[model samples]
Target chain A: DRINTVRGPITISEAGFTLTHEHICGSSAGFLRAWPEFFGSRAALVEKAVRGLRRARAAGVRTIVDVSTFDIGRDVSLLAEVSRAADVHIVAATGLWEDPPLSMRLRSVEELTQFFLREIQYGIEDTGIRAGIIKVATNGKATPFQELVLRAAARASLATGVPVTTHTAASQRDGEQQAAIFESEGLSPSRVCIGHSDDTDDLSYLTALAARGYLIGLDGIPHSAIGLEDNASASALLGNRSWQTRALLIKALIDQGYMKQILVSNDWLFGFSSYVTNIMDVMDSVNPDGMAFIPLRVIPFLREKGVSQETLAGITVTNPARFLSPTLRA
Target chain B: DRINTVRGPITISEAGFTLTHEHICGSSAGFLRAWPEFFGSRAALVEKAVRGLRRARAAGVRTIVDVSTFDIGRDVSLLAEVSRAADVHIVAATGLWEDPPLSMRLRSVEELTQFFLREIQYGIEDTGIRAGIIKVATNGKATPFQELVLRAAARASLATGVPVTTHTAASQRDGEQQAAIFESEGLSPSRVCIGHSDDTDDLSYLTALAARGYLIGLDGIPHSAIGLEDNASASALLGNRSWQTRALLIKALIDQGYMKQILVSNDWLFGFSSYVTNIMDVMDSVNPDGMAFIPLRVIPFLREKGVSQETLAGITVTNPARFLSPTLRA
Candidate 1:
């Protein structure tokens, strides 16, 4: 019994096949807080998220690690409602996302660490849903401010004994610097997940990161190959975002005996935040399954590619278990 | 040199490049009549139609035939408003659609024929905008009822000299019966356009219909079947109707010197029920350019496939002019 779910914490045995990273509702806080009407009413979002989570449950998913942070409109209360309605477990998260506001950037490392620590210990606001893990992110190129936030997340993780997870661009290999920062700040590298490692098809880059004891997040599972044509057409330019490419990468990682270091998720936002809604104009047209992509599409595809059931279980269940279960190193 | 535009009669030369079949706006009459709010306000629809028409104009479309009849939420007043605002000539149709009411079915052939003739000669719903053509439709296996409507349309065509255009089930070759009956009624086969012929890929079927001297309407452009797979998936489920497929059919027709007996359109409905508020959710997603596919993608694609500019103009300009012009032979 180590993590905090939205409703309450449970023993490790109850956490079934877990989605390592996802969001039932991910939106810009600026939009959700300031321009509420533009995003949609809270009721509308809760309904859509519930619908999507039901699909995930239908696909045999028992849990989702919703890593939406303060910067994103991470509402633990709303998440609790979705968890109850969708009937799927959600592990809420703390810490800051990439490019946190200038105000956040101006805060000292200790101040930020205290903020994250508060959420982890007392829970977010009065919802009593303590964050299960610390979340931080780095841009394509790791910046000084990103390194500062990473350090704070590392400190929070070490102090609270919960693990750290990161959002980093695989194309830029920013996960390398993130792993270094976490390790340097007393974060056991094995307890950290480097998100979006599937953004690039570079096998060497993935293997190199996995070798550093980081759980590789091929999190953008149904990855999009945004093949925008040379046109000024105003419509949402659809590209070939196929499952084949990710299967190849994961199969290669498995071949290298790094299956234990991998995790999969769609990182999907089923309910559109007002900012994204305003930008996309309700173009939340992803896989019809919404958040159920992994349980529905990815697992079967990996199975088809001759990946053994054992390794599949490791990536979906065992590996995430190991990452989220910290040694209380503080 | 005659076609009845919303603003009154226009010379064929003024018609310029045309979308042989399309809609300014369309909705369910059942919805629009009783529950007008469900179909959106008239102003909203007019705005969207104007925007799409401007895009068409940018793509060089000078005219369009709004085939929506009274049964299908045909508002000639709204059509006049959109035509005036969009600055494009719209030749409105005066005919019953495929699914006529049981009340209409109870009418005698002479009664149905007189209704169509009145609309053509007098005008649509007190708009005083005379219809340029008679539009009727046929089901998969032409039933006796379908034949009756076709005969009524043929009789009206023969009486008023406004040629008949038909919505045919290409799968069952309904155009054959439509062509046979029009000729049997002493209406010239050249004056008829067997619409939605592009819905099929059978070369023999399309050729046979064209061989009967009816213009082939390849109107549904850039179709889509959105099967967004659940990575937790991506790939387009491209259909038979593509630029390549259209080019192959058109090139073969051009090779046979039958390009003059063809016309292209999107048969697009710019505005729809309020439930489809996302402009794209209204089926604008079928073609990226919306209703401008013919001039934007199809014309350029076929031109690259060695279809001459003059042949292109014949399909867009010449054939529609012929189909809309009448002999007043009654």
Candidate 2:
């Protein structure tokens, strides 16, 4: 039994293959705070989180990293009960997300760092729940707040022996800055997995981070919650050889022995109705049938373009498993 | 007085700009062959070419190189009368196009070279109708036929000191092979341009050719010939930073400096009903108002995205003029 610090007691299965990063529940604070008339009541929010967790269980997903941090609706008690009831491993996170109306009051970097550390420790030691990873997010471009958050996350990871993952902005610089922050914080670069590295077509930047022993997460597959608009023309921007060239980049990185430092996930979230709507819209636009979720349609296209099953396994299983399980750390 | 050789006597204007790559009157091989029962008459063909020239003149386009070289229709006498009536510079070409069934009988590389050279010398020296530029074409992929055609075109260009332009396949490899052929033929790489270079998102290949002193054509803008399936993706692809990087590569080439090589054109054909239909179809699909042709909308986007005026001018004015004028040789 794991007593969640904020919530209560929870139990999970050992056979669970956890998705180390996910959103069981979330509400854009800016959206809510700006227009409480539009987004009313916290009761509906908790129910939405429960519904998503139940859906995940029904779909055979055993665990999820609910990395909703700061102003993004991190309801601990609800999540703990949901995890227990759903029989899935629930890994909560503690870090600063995008600095908007949330971090507006917290002026100093040191103050922000202290707040993050307290939450990190609260999520891990105080609570019996396994606080698996550290989370940090950036704005569309890397700002000082993002750098401070990344530094705090890196420091927290160093103290707690946890791995750090980041939410990058619309640009690749956020990932670069996150890696730089971790490196500067004296954390093992291998313990850092940069998220949203797929937003830009700069393979060299991604490969450079991989070379530094960082795990590169290419989580947002086209029709996922993030959608293609977030990374518009990402494939095209790389050129008509987008898929092939990206595969070659991955292959080269793997050949250089960084195979274990790559992760792939859908980044599909359930709480945001807008995300679902956008994803459905994009799916409809691309594929008239609702078979976007089918691996047969998606995976075969990647495979036909020379992406091997071994590489796919490295991204889906090996890299993520190594990053998440503390005992499997490099 | 130049004696008529390949075509009948036709006076070409020195005043107006000549589009060295255009289709005046001929239908696509597929369209012509498919509807032979409807459009098989010589009178119908001549009427179409004449109407196309009239449209060109109405649009302030005074000169055009009718590079429709193969089995569709090559009525020189009709083209001469159209040129004389419109008072436009009509430069006729003698070369091969890479469309199948019509282009089934393979010509030896040496035979093609001799044939094009004979046409160039005889048409310009004997016939009053000038052969402005050598035209070559490739299938949508860089096939063996395209390579041999490029090789022959390059040889003929070198022998006659005429510029060479090619119809590149949608793939980047087509441009690469065309560049290679021109380089191997001992032709000034600046005098050779690979058309439809914008079809692929592979900017690195385009930049590589541009760096090696070859012109990159961004013709086929709003490419109606290929349909919208690839063009929208191609449009979005051009918006990537890599595409801007390639544009910069062109600028860098000019700065270093070689400005006379780059050229841009519409590759638009008016009289071909199918071509008109396809453009209308694309407009219906993408821009319902036919707003893509508006300079205010298109050029601003290009300018904001780092396409320099000098590069634009090179593509629009200087490069095409250099190719047409014998005195403008490097």
Candidate 3:
């Protein structure tokens, strides 16, 4: 399998100990594009994010996939510097998030897919650094805008022979719906990590998704939905999952033999601005510098509960390589 | 046929005219209970609401079903105060909206239904003000919490011999699905007003709902969804009548003979405070105080389009009486 990291071309062999879904910067492009003053400082954002990136590096993170999209204030140029300073291979994504620019509001699926293909082939904007992964997100159900984005992401993945991933409103049990769209668009269901699987206690939902050979992101550790941010909960990351809360669910998933099809991350929002809220509340309160939580807290808890180190490695390293590997079929 | 109004019991003959689904004093019970300083003034809200209610009264609106649920700061006592001040009858609703308060989050369906029953029989919070309608809101599809509310509302309606109405996120095309749940709970299809039928341009969806004999609320008028608040437009009143927009849909429905089963309102929030958000930006900027829009503008437009005054009166007057008529099966 071949690969592309923001640092440059890196083969699958070099991609190690990956944090499959982490964001160094998840800012809003629409806001920063027009009103730069809305954000205090872009340099301050980079500095704050690099600090978090280094913490993940210290936790043995060799590579990270920055899953923020173009519409979400994703800056790959800043990502490259942050990657270099943190001494980690950062995978910049090429795709749209929930809301793209106003001009892109009515773009056809073909138009969006072609835009993504160009970024995957060449680079983002005028920057010569090519993107590493294609990423997307949708809430409980796909609106027309969200569905078009999913279709576009699917098309880009099929076109470039790369894997696809998604943010699902897991409690809504909508991950299967996302897989349906992706699979219908010719992307292998196995290629997707139905992000936020730990949000639900629904066994049938979990088993069915894993049965499709897809992966689940048991992210959102150390943060409870109800306890944080003044009712900031959406359908996506449905609720809080304390280690004890879902120790049984995770254990059951591993025992059910979908270990290889699981990915782990904190959904850390380091210094990145929320496009909608224009705030850094996630960084300040939710899980302050959360890259360390996966290594220091979640892994130890899992290990204590009898999760094998190899299974952990598969979820973090092998799985990332398998999913993020760019297969130039031509 | 006796209809319960906040003022007292009224026969269907005395029902006169109605705005079937409207809000006069929507406030956040949790926030207002906990933090009074966070608000401007309740008296200000009361005064503003009374002014709007008197305007509706002047426009010949004799009864208004205040469909704000308990979760969205439903204030039956306050509506009574507004009703007394404005010399108009108000029908307060008993149900949940959006998400229930933290205390009511994990209640069982049976327990929730009983609470609604108690409010119907006795009073709300010792205020001696009984609810006249059952209101519940949902988006795209029913989440676990929403499904429980629907089941509870259905059970409550069946037991109390009242009617049930819903806040349908019409764009998601999920009303039929909500209707399916209510039907399963033994709620008569005809006794339900599948509110927000006017939000979607989908004729098949509207026609199919009307075919089931459920009253559709073409409630959104004098405004469009784009320029409004979070739950933006309600009903199918997405601007453009003749006059342009949904006038054709309404005309079609009337020609198809479903006008007698239709209800029209603005889904107005004269003095309602959004619990999580305290922004009056919607009232000040997006749409002005929306009480008299239906009578002053929508009615004239419908009349100009050659809609019979009797049919128009049926939607406003007779339909409300039919839905709100309280009966005891002995």
Candidate 4:
């Protein structure tokens, strides 16, 4: 079966070296509508993403899952533009972020499920670019609204045969509860990716989830990973220590034989801003490698740590394709 | 201005001896729609409410602020039928319960605000029964959905000339956060009644909120009050100990010169059921006085403790009228 992408479906084999979770742009929900100027022109945003994705392509990335859900300002046209320009497969997402809008809470599970179905089946906002995966999120305790959206996302995944991925507070072990909810909805653990799994060093929690067949998303590397600093000065090298900690978590998981279940990415937001879109300038200064950080830096580091090339390939390539492919029940 | 009730509007003075917070029927949202058989017949529910309300009226309850929001099955038709039959003013509510349905989470603050506005400005359903107060609720911490509805309820109250009432997890002092939200929205503290204040004996919290001009709702008397039992047998007498504690709380508030800020009630759910409507049978057996528990028992107990007739009138009559009456901005 072909995997859905922004440029349309591609054969599973064509989906290679995929960064299972990353954002081309992560704007606050409706930020563009309220302050379009803050994000610059659409052309500028697309050009920047195309430039970023092109480097990843050159560094051996063939696919990227744009896990920016509707609430995070998922723009299908932008993904299509960047994918076509960068010549890399881009999978857009359908669902919500953790702090959902007030409107999301007002809908029934069926209504929300239908909403996700419409985007996945027909198109996202008339672009005709279908989302490949269902994305839902929660932090600490899932609010009533979050729970509502979770069930809706799970049901939508069940109907569409798409996999469900989640943004979780890893330190809180929030994914355990997320898995329970999905499991209750009859969603198989194998069809789920617990995103941001590397944020915590809880090897037991990570392995337990991975052992249950859920994909462990070590997707926050450059931004939030932890590592031993070469010196006190290197410790202050922006994201150095962060990336190291995440790499260590990845090594531990692989050592415990979870390589095939691990999906890795930088979670780089090529066009994100809390106050102004110019925040990218600061981000670039800190992690200049961006999405290419995985292929150029992290993999080499893992190899040094004795993680096999075959295992790294499984995490970055085969695992994503397997997770993304529709596994509709008989 | 007049207080709106199921029967229509009445002068503030006419709304005497009011129970500020009580639920005539606390059903799960849309419970009757799903399992009407479980609730028995509508006539039976109305007859039961009429019987309970009649006793409360005979014991000096002239008005009852039924803080049963729409999500809690605030049936204006039912409220009208019972109010008409019992010859008592029954003020209906417009807002949501603590554990709101999934549909409520989907609505926006403006959408929910307009909903409450419609119910107050126009009528509830086709019944032409306008809600007098906006009832919103929260537990330990307000969820995003609850916060959304709280803002909506506050805005609705601000737009129309109605007051806001709240259901709070008393021990958590959830009302402090509730008051902060209302304060941020520019709602006057005088137009808000912090419900379930007697659920905790945190006199500091009660008087602190009262000192800030909020009405402290001592409305869980017979259901959750604590009393010094005459004997171990009396302690086991259903709601005796619970009522005693609530009475002591009332007395303490009266001693602290906050008597004018206290509004008392039984919080009797005349048609409530967790598993079956027959649960009310056990409830009746425990607190035989039902809605009249305050006037019939707690008041006499407080009188013996040296609480004057004036203080009782202030809590049961004047305080509710003052708190429930709209304080629209100039």
Candidate 2 docking quality: incorrect, acceptable, medium or high: incorrect
Spell out the clash pairs found in candidate 2.
Answer: A7-A77, A239-B201, A240-B201, B3-B126, B264-B315
Evaluate residue A200 in candidate 1 and report its C-alpha lDDT on the 0 to 100 scale: 76
Q: Candidate 4 — which residues are off by over 4 angstroms?
A: A225-241, A274-279, B1-330
lDDT of 2 by residue, B45-89 (tens): 556556655655654455566766533234455567666766665
Of candidates 4 and 3, the better by lDDT: 4
lDDT per residue for candidate 3 within B144-233, as digits (tens), equals 878888999888888877788888888787789888998898788777888877777888888888898787877765446453434523
Among all candidates shown, the one with the greatest DockQ: 4
Residues A150-241 of candidate 1: C-alpha lDDT, one tens digit per residue: 89888888877787778876678888788778878777777788887777778777888788677788887654534434422213222244
lDDT of 2 by residue, A1-330 (tens): 231222433333242444555665454322222112222334554555466556556654555667766445454555676666666666677665652332222235565555556555544323444455677887556676677777777777777666777887635466666666677878887777787665556767777787777788664443332234554433232222233333344555566777777665445444442222233234334423221222333345557767788666545545655676542245
2 versus 4: better DockQ goes to: 4
Model 1 misses residue B94 by how many Å?
53
Query: DockQ values for all predictions?
Result: 0.01, 0.00, 0.01, 0.02
Ranking by lDDT: 4, 1, 3, 2
lDDT of 4: 0.78
* Per-model lDDT: 0.72, 0.54, 0.71, 0.78
- What range of 10 consecutive residues in model 3 chain A has the weakest lDDT sum? A30-39
What tens-digit string does per-residue lDDT give for candidate 4 at A33-95? 322444466668778888888999999999999998766766677788789999999998988
> Residue A24: error of model 2 in Å?
2.2
Question: For model 3, what is the alpha-carbon lDDT of residue A318?
Answer: 86
CAPRI tier of model 3: incorrect
User: Candidate 4 lDDT, tens digit per residue, B1-330?
Assistant: 788999999999999888888887876443333223444766677778899899989998899988887657566777888899999999999887764533345557876786788779887756778889999889879998788888888898888869888888888999999999988888888778898887787878888898988888877777631343343432432334456877798889878888777778877887764323245676677788898888899989999999888878877777787777776741
